PDB file of C-alpha atoms in Angstrom:
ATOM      1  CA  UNK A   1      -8.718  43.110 -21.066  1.00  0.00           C
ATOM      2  CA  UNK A   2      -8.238  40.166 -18.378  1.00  0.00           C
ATOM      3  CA  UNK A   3     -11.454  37.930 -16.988  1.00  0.00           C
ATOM      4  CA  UNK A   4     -11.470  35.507 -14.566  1.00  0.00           C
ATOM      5  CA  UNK A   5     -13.185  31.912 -15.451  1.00  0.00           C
ATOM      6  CA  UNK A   6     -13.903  30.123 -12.303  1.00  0.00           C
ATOM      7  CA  UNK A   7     -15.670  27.133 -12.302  1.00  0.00           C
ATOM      8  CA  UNK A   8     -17.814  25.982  -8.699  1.00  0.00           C
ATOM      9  CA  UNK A   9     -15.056  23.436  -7.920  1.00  0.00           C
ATOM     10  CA  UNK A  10     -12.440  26.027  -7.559  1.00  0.00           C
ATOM     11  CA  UNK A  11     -10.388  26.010 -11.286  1.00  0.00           C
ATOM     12  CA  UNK A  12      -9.718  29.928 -12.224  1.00  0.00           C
ATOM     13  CA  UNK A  13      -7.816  30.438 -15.710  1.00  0.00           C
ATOM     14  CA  UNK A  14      -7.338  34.073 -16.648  1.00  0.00           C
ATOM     15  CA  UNK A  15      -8.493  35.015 -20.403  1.00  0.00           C
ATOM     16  CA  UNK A  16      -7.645  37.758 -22.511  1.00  0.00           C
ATOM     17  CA  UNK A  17     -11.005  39.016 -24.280  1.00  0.00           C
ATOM     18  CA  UNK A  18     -12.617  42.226 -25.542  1.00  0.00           C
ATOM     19  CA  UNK A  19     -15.760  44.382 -24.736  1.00  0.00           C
ATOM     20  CA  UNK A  20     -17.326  43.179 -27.996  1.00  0.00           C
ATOM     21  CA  UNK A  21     -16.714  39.478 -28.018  1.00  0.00           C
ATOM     22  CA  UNK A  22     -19.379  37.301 -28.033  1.00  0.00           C
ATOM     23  CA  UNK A  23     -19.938  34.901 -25.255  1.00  0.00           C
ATOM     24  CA  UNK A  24     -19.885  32.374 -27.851  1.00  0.00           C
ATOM     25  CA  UNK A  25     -16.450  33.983 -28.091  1.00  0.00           C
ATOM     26  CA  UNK A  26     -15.526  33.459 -25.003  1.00  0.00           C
ATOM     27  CA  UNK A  27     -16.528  30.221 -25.476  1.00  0.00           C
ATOM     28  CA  UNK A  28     -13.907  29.492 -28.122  1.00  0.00           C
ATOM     29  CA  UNK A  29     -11.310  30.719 -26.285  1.00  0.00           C
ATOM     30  CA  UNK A  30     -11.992  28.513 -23.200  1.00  0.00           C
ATOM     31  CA  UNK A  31     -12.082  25.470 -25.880  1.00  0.00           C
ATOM     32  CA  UNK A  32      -8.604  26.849 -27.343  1.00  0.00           C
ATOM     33  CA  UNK A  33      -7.122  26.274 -23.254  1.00  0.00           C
ATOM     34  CA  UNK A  34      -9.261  23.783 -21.724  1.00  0.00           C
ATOM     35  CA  UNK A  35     -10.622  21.400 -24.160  1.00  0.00           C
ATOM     36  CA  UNK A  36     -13.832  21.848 -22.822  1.00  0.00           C
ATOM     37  CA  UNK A  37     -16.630  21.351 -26.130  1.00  0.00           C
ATOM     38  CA  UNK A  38     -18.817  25.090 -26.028  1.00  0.00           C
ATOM     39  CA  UNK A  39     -22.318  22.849 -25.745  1.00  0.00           C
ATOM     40  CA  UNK A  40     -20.833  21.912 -22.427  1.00  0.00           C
ATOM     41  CA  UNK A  41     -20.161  25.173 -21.482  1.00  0.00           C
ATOM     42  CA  UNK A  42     -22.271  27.440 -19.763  1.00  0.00           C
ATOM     43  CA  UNK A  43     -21.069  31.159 -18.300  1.00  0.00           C
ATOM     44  CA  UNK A  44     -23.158  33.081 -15.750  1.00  0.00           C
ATOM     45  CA  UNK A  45     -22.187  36.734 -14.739  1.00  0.00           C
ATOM     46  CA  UNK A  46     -24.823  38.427 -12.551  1.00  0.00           C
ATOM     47  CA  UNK A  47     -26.536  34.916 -11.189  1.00  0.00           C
ATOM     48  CA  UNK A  48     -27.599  34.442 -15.010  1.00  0.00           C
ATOM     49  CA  UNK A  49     -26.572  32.263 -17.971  1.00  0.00           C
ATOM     50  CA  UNK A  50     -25.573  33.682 -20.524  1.00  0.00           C
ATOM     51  CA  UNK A  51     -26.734  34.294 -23.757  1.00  0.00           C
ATOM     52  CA  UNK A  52     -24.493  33.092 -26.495  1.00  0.00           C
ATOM     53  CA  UNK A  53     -24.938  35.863 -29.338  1.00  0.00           C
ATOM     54  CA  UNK A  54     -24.332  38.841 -26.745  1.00  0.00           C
ATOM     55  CA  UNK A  55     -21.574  40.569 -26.291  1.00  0.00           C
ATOM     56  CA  UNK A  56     -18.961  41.399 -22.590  1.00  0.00           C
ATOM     57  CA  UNK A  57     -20.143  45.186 -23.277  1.00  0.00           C
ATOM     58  CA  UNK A  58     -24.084  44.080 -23.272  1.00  0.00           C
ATOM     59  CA  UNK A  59     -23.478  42.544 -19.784  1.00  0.00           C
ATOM     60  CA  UNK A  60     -21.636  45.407 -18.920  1.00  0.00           C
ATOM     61  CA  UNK A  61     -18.782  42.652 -17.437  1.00  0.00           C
ATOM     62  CA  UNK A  62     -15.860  44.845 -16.418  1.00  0.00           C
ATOM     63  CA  UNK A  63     -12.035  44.545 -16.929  1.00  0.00           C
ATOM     64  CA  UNK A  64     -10.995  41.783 -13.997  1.00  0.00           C
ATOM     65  CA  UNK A  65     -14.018  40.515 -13.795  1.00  0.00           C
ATOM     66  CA  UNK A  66     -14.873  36.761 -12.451  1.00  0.00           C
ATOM     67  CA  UNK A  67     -17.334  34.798 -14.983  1.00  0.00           C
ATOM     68  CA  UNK A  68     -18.538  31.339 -13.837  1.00  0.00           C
ATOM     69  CA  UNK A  69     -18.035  27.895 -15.824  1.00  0.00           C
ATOM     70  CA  UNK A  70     -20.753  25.609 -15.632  1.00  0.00           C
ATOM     71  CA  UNK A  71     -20.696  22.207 -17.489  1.00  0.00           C
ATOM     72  CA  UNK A  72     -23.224  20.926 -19.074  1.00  0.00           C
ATOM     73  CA  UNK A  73     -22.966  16.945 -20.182  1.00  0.00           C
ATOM     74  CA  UNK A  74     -26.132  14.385 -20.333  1.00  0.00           C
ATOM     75  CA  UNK A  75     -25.269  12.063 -17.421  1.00  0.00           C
ATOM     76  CA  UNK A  76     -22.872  13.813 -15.106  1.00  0.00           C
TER      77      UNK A  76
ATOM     78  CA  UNK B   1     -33.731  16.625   4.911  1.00  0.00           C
ATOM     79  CA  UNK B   2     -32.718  20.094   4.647  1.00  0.00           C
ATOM     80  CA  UNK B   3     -30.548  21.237   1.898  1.00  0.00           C
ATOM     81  CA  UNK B   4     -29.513  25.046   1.165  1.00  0.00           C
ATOM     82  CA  UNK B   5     -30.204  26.938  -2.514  1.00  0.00           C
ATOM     83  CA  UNK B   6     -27.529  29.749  -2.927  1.00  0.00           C
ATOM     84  CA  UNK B   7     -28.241  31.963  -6.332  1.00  0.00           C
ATOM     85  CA  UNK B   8     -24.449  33.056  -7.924  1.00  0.00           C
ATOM     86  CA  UNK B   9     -24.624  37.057  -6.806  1.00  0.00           C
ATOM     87  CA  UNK B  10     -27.725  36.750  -4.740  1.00  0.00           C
ATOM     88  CA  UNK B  11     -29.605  35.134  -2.110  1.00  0.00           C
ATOM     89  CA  UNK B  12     -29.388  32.040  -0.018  1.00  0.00           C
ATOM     90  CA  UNK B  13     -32.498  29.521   1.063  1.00  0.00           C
ATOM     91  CA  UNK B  14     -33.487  26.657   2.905  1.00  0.00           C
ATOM     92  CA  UNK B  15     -35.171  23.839   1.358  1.00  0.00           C
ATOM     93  CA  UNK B  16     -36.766  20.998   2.735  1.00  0.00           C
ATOM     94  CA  UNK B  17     -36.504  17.960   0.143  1.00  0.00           C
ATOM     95  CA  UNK B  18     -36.268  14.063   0.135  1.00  0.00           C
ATOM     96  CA  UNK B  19     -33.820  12.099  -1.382  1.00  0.00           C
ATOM     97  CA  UNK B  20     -35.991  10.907  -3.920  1.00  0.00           C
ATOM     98  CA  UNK B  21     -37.081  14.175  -5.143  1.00  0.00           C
ATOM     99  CA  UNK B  22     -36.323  14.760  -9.026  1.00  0.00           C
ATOM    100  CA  UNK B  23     -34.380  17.891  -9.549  1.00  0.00           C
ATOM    101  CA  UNK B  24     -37.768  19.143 -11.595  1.00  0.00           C
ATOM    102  CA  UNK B  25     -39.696  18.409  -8.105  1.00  0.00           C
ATOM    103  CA  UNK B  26     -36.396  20.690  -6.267  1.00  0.00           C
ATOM    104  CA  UNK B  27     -37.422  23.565  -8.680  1.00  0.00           C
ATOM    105  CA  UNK B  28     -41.076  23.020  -8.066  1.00  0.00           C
ATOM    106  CA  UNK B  29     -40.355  23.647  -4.590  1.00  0.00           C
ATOM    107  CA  UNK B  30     -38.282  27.041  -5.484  1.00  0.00           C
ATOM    108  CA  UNK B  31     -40.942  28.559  -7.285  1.00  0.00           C
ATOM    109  CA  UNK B  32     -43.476  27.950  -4.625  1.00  0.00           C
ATOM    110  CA  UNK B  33     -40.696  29.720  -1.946  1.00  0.00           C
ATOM    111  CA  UNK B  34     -39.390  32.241  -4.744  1.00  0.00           C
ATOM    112  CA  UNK B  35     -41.669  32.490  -7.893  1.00  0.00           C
ATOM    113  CA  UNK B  36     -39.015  32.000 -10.348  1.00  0.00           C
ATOM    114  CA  UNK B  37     -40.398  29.824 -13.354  1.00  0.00           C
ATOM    115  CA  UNK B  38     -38.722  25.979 -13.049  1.00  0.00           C
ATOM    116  CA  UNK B  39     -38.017  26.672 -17.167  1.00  0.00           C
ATOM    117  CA  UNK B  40     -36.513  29.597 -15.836  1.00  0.00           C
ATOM    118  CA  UNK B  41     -33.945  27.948 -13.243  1.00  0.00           C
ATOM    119  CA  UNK B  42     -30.517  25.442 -13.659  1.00  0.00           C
ATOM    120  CA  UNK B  43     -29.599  23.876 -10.771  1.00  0.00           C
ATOM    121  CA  UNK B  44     -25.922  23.083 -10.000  1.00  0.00           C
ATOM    122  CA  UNK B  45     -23.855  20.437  -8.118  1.00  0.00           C
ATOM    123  CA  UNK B  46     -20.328  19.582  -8.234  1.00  0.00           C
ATOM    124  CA  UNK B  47     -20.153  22.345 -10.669  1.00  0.00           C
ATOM    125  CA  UNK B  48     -22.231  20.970 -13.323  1.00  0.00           C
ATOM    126  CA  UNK B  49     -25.811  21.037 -14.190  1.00  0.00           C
ATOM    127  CA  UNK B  50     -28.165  19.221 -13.096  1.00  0.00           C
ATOM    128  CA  UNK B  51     -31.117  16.900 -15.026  1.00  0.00           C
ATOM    129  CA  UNK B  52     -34.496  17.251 -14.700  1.00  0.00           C
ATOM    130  CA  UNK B  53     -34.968  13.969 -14.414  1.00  0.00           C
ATOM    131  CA  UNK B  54     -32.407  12.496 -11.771  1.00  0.00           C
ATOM    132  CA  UNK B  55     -32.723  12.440  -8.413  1.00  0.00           C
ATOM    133  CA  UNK B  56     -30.927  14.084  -5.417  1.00  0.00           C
ATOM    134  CA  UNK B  57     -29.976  10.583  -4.392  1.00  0.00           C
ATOM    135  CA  UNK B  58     -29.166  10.028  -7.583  1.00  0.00           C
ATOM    136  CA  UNK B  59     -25.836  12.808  -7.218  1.00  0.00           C
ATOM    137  CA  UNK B  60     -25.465  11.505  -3.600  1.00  0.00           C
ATOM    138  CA  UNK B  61     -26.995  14.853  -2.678  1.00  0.00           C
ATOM    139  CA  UNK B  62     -27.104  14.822   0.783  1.00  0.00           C
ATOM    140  CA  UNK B  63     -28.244  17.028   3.713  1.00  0.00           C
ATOM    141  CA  UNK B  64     -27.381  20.221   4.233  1.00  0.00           C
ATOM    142  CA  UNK B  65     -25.501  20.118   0.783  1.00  0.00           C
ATOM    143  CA  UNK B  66     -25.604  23.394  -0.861  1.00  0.00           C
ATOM    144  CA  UNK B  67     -27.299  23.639  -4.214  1.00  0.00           C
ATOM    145  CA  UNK B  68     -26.311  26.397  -6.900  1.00  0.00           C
ATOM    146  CA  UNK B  69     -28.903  28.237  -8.934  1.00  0.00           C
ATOM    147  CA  UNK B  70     -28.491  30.274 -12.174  1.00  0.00           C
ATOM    148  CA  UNK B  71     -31.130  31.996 -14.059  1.00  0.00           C
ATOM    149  CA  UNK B  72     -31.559  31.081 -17.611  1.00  0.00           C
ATOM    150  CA  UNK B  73     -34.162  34.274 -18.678  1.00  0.00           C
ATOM    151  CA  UNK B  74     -36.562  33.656 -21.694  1.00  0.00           C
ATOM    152  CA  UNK B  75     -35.345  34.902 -25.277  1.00  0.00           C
TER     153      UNK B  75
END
């Protein structure tokens, strides 16, 4: 399926994931386009963060669904 | 100064802050308006997070900026 991954300064890339990917998954896969370390990178669905070890399904995040990108890095 | 708290998929506030205000004073200040745990909240600006440490002033925070907040549940 296709999410959205929109960061709060108005970037959207589209991602191809499944159900049972990780976020940690997801992470990869915006490292594999972006660049973007997955320490730095934090993705909230629902107004929460995240957990790295659970999966699309467990957050019940729906084909064409919008996930936000927060970045995390010490000093900015 | 006033400055405005909006959660992702949820609910705006008002706060009022000072520039010199740490961003761990900023979620002081939530928790007294909203009762979510400060260990609980992340704080957002310019679409990264925010340190506990720093200062609005020290982001150029300004007022009526908007603040993010995202909820970062225990375990």
């Amino acid at each position: 399926m296709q999410i959205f991954v929109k960061t709060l300064t108005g970037k959207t890339i589209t991602l191809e994931v499944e159900p049972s990917d990780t976020i940690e998954n997801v992470k990869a896969k915006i490292q594999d386009k972006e660049g973007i370390p997955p320490d730095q990178q934090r993705l909230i669905f629902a107004g929460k963060q995240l957990e790295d070890g659970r999966t699309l399904s467990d957050y019940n995040i729906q084909k064409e669904s919008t996930l936000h990108l927060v970045l995390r890095l010490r000093g900015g």
